[PDB]
Amino acid sequence: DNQFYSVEVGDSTFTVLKRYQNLKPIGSGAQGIVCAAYDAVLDRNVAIKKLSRPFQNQTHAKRAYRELVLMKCVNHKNIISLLNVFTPQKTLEEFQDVYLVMELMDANLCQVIQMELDHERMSYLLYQMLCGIKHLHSAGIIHRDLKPSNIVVKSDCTLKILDFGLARTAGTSFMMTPYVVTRYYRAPEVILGMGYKENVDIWSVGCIMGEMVRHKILFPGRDYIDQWNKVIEQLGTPCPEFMKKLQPTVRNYVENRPKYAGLTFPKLFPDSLFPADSEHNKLKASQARDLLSKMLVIDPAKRISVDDALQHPYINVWYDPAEVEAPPPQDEREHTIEEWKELIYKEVMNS
Ligand SMILES: *CCC(=O)Nc1cccc(C(=O)Nc2ccc(Nc3cc(-c4c(-c5ccc(F)cc5)nc(SC)n4C)ccn3)cc2)c1
What we know:
Elements: E1 4-9, E2 12-17, E3 20-29, E4 32-39, E5 44-52, H1 58-70, E6 84-86, E7 97-103, E8 107-108, H2 109-113, H3 119-138, E9 151-153, E10 159-161, H4 188-191, H5 200-214, H6 224-235, H7 240-244, H8 248-255, H9 265-268, H10 279-295, H11 306-310, H12 321-324, H13 337-350
Antiparallel strand pairs: 1-2, 3-4, 4-5, 5-7, 6-7, 8-9, 9-10
Helix pairs in contact: 1-13, 3-5, 5-10
The structure holds the ligand *CCC(=O)Nc1cccc(C(=O)Nc2ccc(Nc3cc(-c4c(-c5ccc(F)cc5)nc(SC)n4C)ccn3)cc2)c1.
Organism: Homo sapiens
Catalytic activity: L-seryl-[protein] + ATP = O-phospho-L-seryl-[protein] + ADP + H(+); L-threonyl-[protein] + ATP = O-phospho-L-threonyl-[protein] + ADP + H(+)
Protein name: Mitogen-activated protein kinase 10
């Protein structure tokens, strides 16, 4: 339409409503390309993400669809809120591309992770992640795949989570895919198919926190086997009560491995990794390790809750009940490509 215009961006074309001006690439990911733009209607800077033919892959289709639907089920400053959703195509038959628009953020969390460790920044970033997760949980959404690639940050250290994680059933049966999926941030109970509760998400917060300290991914498994091995190498073989919760076939798989004692948290995260040379810095290194030791707990029956993390002395200087308790607003079958296409098209057309 006359309502759209096209901009060349590397290999791609962004065909966007004319309100969006001065497009500039940010970059690309598994789920689309992103540009910054000025929105002349709102008089503010936005990020625009293009989803190309998401209906052509069942995993991509389900993600796009569930994320359009769940967008309306949350309302919190630490979770994505779309300003606009559109397609330049005019009929179901011609439909190919979805464009999502939100507030422009300044950086990916990975860029912050690369910066020198600072307790005020790390604690504030973790506090916001935990506020977001708590909000998701109150809306009935237990994420199970929180990772730095879906977290963005502004220059004022404010943070947003951009995705809603896994289908409800994921983590209720053993995880190995026909191809590589990375699972560096997924909880033990999920990857082993044990079922899960809310504190499944605390594991992933612990992975992120640890990564902030080390500047390195904690458990970078090459495949599902190596993933588990990176975990037990560092944290130790889990307790028999945890093994007893495994389906017998899974239990044999898990136990047919070396037995590890695990390393203490001071060895996992040495003093040298933290700011030194003041009582404040010594105490904060101790509190950070304490919190790490409570989140990076293989057995979810022994792992800290979201509320306990929020109330931990490392985090709680930021605690504001208006942020922590902000309330959310008042179907996962499989489908063919054509079914997914229509479902997604209908969601786009209706908001
Ligand atoms: C750690 C490695 C790295 O990222 N390096 C690096 C080096 C130099 C520059 C950059 C950089 O350009 N990063 C940057 C700039 C601006 C943003 N803003 C942004 C991105 C996103 C976004 C979206 C999205 C989702 C929904 C929507 F409606 C619009 C946009 N989807 C993704 S991929 C999960 N991103 C990142 C939203 C809002 N603002 C980010 C990063 C990086």
